[PDB]
Amino acid sequence: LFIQTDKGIYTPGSPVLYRVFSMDHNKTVIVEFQTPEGILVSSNSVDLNFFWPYNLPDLVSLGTWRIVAKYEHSPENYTAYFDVRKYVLPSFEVRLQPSEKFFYIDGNENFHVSITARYLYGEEVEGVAFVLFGVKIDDAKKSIPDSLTRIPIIDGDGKATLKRDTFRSRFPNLNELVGHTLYASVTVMTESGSDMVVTEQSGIHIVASPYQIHFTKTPKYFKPGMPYELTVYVTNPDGSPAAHVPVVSEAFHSMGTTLSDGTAKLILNIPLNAQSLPITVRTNHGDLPRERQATKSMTAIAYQTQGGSGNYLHVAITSTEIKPGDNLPVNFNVKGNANSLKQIKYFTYLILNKGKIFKVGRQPRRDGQNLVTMNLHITPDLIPSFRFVAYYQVGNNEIVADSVWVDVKDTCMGTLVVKGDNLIQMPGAAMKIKLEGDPGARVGLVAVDKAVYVLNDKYKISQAKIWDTIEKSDFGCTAGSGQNNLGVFEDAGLALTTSTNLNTKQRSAAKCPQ
Amino acid sequence: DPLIEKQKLKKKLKEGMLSIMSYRNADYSYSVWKGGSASTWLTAFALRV
Amino acid sequence: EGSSSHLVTFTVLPLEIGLHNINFSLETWFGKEILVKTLRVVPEGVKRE
Amino acid sequence: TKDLTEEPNSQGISSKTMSFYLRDSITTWVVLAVSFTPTKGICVAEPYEIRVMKVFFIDLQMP
Amino acid sequence: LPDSLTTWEIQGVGISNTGICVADTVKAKVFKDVFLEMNIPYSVVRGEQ
Amino acid sequence: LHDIRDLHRYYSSESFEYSNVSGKVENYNGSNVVRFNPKDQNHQLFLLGKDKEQYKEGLQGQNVFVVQELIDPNGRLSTVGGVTKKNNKTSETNTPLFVNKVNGEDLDASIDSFLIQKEEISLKELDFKIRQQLVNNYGLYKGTSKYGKIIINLKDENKVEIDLGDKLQFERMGDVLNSKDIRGISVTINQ
Amino acid sequence: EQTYVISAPKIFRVGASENIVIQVYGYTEAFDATISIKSYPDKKFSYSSGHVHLSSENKFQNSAILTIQPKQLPGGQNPVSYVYLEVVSKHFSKSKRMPITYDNGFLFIHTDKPVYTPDQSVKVRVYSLNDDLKPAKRETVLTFIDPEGSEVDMVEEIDHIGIISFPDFKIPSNPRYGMWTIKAKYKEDFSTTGTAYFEVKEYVLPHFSVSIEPEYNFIGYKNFKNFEITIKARYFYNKVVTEADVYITFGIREDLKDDQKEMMQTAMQNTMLINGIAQVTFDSETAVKELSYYSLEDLNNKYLYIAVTVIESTGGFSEEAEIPGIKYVLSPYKLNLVATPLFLKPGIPYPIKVQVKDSLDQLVGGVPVTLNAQTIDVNQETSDLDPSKSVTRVDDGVASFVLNLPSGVTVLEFNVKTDAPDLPEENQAREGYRAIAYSSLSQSYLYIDWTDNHKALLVGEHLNIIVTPKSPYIDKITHYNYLILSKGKIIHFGTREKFSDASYQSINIPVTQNMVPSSRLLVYYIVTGEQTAELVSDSVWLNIEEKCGNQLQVHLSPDADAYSPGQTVSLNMATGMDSWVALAAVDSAVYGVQRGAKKPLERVFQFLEKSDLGCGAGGGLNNANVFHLAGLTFLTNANADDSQENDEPCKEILLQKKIEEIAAKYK
Ligand SMILES: *[C@@H]1O[C@H](CO)[C@@H](O[C@@H]2O[C@H](CO)[C@@H](O)[C@H](O)[C@H]2NC(C)=O)[C@H](O)[C@H]1NC(C)=O
């Protein structure tokens, strides 16, 4: 389920109208309205075609109501939040842009926050703004009183700065800040004394590092005497991906540079007698001093070819950032026992996704091919993330396999764009907008005064939150591979039984042991 | 500047010679008006120039 | 009208010989245009000794 | 809730035009479209900004 | 700019020790909406209306 | 004056250059020391090159490639040598320069260029910029990169060498080279 | 057994900084080698020499750079063709006569617009670079030419930075209307050429604007039976005409600017322009017949020509108007190979990429493509591969295929065609190619791939390149080696020891400035035998991103999308330290007044790409070709370089009474 409410915030007395979508797969849905006090006030049983609004009484609880939808008898418990509050959509947007994405909990850098302010109607605002800085210890704030200062917003612009020294003089006990957030309370006020808005540049993270290295996206198992592809993922301290951060490991004198999604595939050449594989990644950035930029280590195990045969399978996926309707070639690499590969006839692959087995198929190999490759055609289905598992069998007794996991561009399966003219309209005037989409599609439009739309960012439903919310079903559990041929199939969310009573571990349930 | 003014003028001069080339013909004789058979006279004038 | 054109006239007559220049303005629901013209005015049968 | 019933083009897109009256609001409207399809399922649109304004007016900042 | 309707297309360049550099073509279309033009005649005679 | 971290810094630093600076000699200890009002503070120069023994007299409007080796709290800083002729012909040669990267049995190397911006040029200025380029385009002083040499070719049997492991000490910094003479630079960086 | 490997560009360029590199799989006593360039047969003159010292420290691979500074004859032309390359080892010693050219650099003559009207001033400047792609303070000469072969004006300027601003050229009061030609040429030693065109036309103040737009700019069976033609007329911008007779006539025409056309009795009569607009439909099949004796659009791959006369019945006026050609094509599509050479390694998937452009030369998304193919054994046998079908990516017009080849093949003939769920079988697009086997009695080959498509390739990234070396009688490969070409010169090179046991492996090559527009990469290994020698290689081409190196950007004070006239506006300029800028503002609409190919600066890099002696995806036909096909020639090879033959052009890829009378008497 996925809820959408006309806006993020409401007059008492107004009627909150919602629409509730389901990623289609007897359709009966339960919708509920709880107040922020906590009380229930409506329990409705709608069909996915039609629904009404909840009329907020001219006199009713204030705060952040929860609209919560689920399926009769199956804890999907999906939810959506709206604010209801006595207010006055002020006539002008304020936008903040902090100087860096983070604050060095032990440096010298002063903290600038730039302020731009413009009437919803698209002209520059003129006025005066109070900015107060502080730190957020979880669900508490702590002003830096002396940091509060007044600044002229002229022709819509102006900078509000926090001074390091004031900072220290408020928090000389460094130990207290560890893992928190600087916050900028900004109040801006039109020169006319008429209208005035307030927002907050939050979630500025205090730390020692400008970046964050993560390995879970790269398998914990590798094929010896075979190139192992390490996949580094580099988040800005919040969680976001940060791109174009270069990374290296000197242990391999190999370097790379994250991309549009936070990933870099640094390839590694691996000596044959290997078993362990310690790797240490550093965030090499020509602007950050070494000691700043972050580091993280992991050690990967070697595969365990069945009965020590020496018969290894690697399946490399070549491309990067993958668009649906793409042609991405996939590399089948084998290795080992001579008169073993002599009888490697066909590869068997399955593409797993959403936590079920989508398409399955065979890729012939002809003799002499130790590297045989095949073009796969990505199609919407595999959004947002699909796994590739593949294996071969020697002489109807040995099975060896590998799985690689791939992120498809987290996008719309089909198309939907609201086409217009973008020329400045006049009040109550006649308007035309074209609507381009998937045939037979049902479209739910809403029009909204810039005001509300900015004021409540978090609650809006977005393709992003959608996809993540579905990805969080695929029963897979590592970037791929496994201890061993069985282990590839277990880790990759599959279960296996062969004539030869060789079987996957007993599945315990969804979720995976940390 | 002299060497400069001289330049300017030489330039005007060529640009102004160019004008008449339009009215020159196939066989390198010049027509009175554009598209008209050429005149022994005009061609003689253009030579004079 | 929408996507079209409307017309405009000013009936005028000048007295000062060669008097010039007329600010011509158009305001619309979008702003003001000051288009500037210059009008040319003249006697009746000319000659120069 | 408009329904895109209409022969697609070469590309497989349907294009449904739409007429409607703007509001007296002197501001910037923002249109959000969502589409549900049997096959493609859900699809969040590209926010379309419609921007209203006139050359002379009153702002009535009022409590 | 020049008071004159047209879509300007402005593209600079920069050649320096590192190589030549074609910058990014920047467009700037002048006005639209609703305008006015006038048909002022070359000459007019005093006493003409 | 060794290390690794260190090297990155001293070679990353703000390089500056000046001219028309004439100054009289005064030895603060061994043989020398001078000073100059750049326009913001009051510098200090330790000539002690084999070109200092021909210059214990003072400077006459020369070019001095001043890069801070260490600083006092008033904007002033000490720099070693870096003095060149002046009038130094601002002729601008483009010089060949090979850069090889060793790695036991592995080799990645490049043909590239270095831009000499003078007629005569202090070996100090050479030392600095030669490594400047290196540090930003050839990953010098980041990781295992910290050993290697720089051979500069001048005539059929003449070359100057420079260990990278420890910036080239200050006494040869008074030394000087004729731009036209530099056949080219060869740099190898092992790991 | 153990030869050396001297490599360098297929040709030299006079006054060019020229790179020469030198491997050697060869023994451990460090030694010295002289590399010279001497006179073409003589050998007494030594234009330049470098004394590289390859040693153990040096992985016995090094390089120096040579040059030929104008040493010829400066009062009597006549170049020299050819000149000697030479190595003088302690161990070996060997030479190679080889060509040179006086074609150094490029001249891009920026004309301030591309159409001009009498008395207008042709503003003209020239950007002027040298092989190396730096400025090039060179004395430069442009020379103007009229439309009829007369060297009208001719002026020369000096140069202090690459932008030579020239003395504007005023058309004349009353010009020779036509296709004016500007020619650029350096004054001295070299011979480089730049060239530009500008159309000079006569302005006529018409009484209508007479627009005349057809369905699409081409005809394919889809509309062969009925071609839609909308024709319009108007006045001051927006006000449209209202009453008008409209007369169209058609004809067929062998092409364009051939000032002739067979026109057909059936000049489709008045539709009458009513209110800014009028419309007509035109049967190609029908008309084409009797007069033009054609009867099937097969007999048609040429243009349909349209002539219209609108006459406003109100005031009694009349303007003409016309399209000169609308090409006839036996298919909407036309397709071609991209990034895929016709040279295959056995036991190695052969990739294949087809682009499907429409008649309007654009990439067309979502097109079905069919692939058939026959293989021929070394054995002579013939095998029919079962078709493979794939659909063209949304943005690239690229349909991708791969086929794993049976070791035993040596020539692969194939078939691409289209498959739109409506187009007739006849009218689909088909194209046939054939690909040959890398030949080597060594039986051993090589092949390098890397992980990319939608290949951005940003400088400062690291290219992870998989080298797989199959089919070698013997893998027994000491070292893989590499050359990095870019802009006809070599800029990276070196070696990596193989991994003494395993199959394919991975080199990590960093991407740098030198390689910016596009770079070639070729990798060779040395299989040896008591027949001392066998070199074998492969090469790819590499589109890395157009990053100016300095970094010019430019913006306007208010970035809004409409600007009220005259409104004072700012112009800010981003750059890379101290760059030099030549701004230029033009009416975007001038362009549309000459269907001619785009003349804006974007045609630069392309033009500036002819630099590269390369030719194709890379990957020649044999260690020889590969290199030549990558713009090199080499010396050493005990195994031997081929001296090409000659340079073929090649393309890369990234109602009656009257008519009887006048017609007749039209003697
Ligand atoms: C769905 O929503 C409710 C909130 O109304 C969740 O709240 C908890 O439910 C558990 C399950 O029994 C109770 O034991 C707790 O009293 C609730 N409190 C908290 C901490 O949320 C509920 O868990 C949800 N359903 C599921 C999936 O358990």
Ligand SMILES: *[C@@H]1O[C@H](CO)[C@@H](O)[C@H](O)[C@H]1NC(C)=O
């Ligand atoms: C017309 O307007 C201009 C500028 O728009 C101004 O400077 C001038 O004084 C005006 N002239 C007339 C005739 O009113």
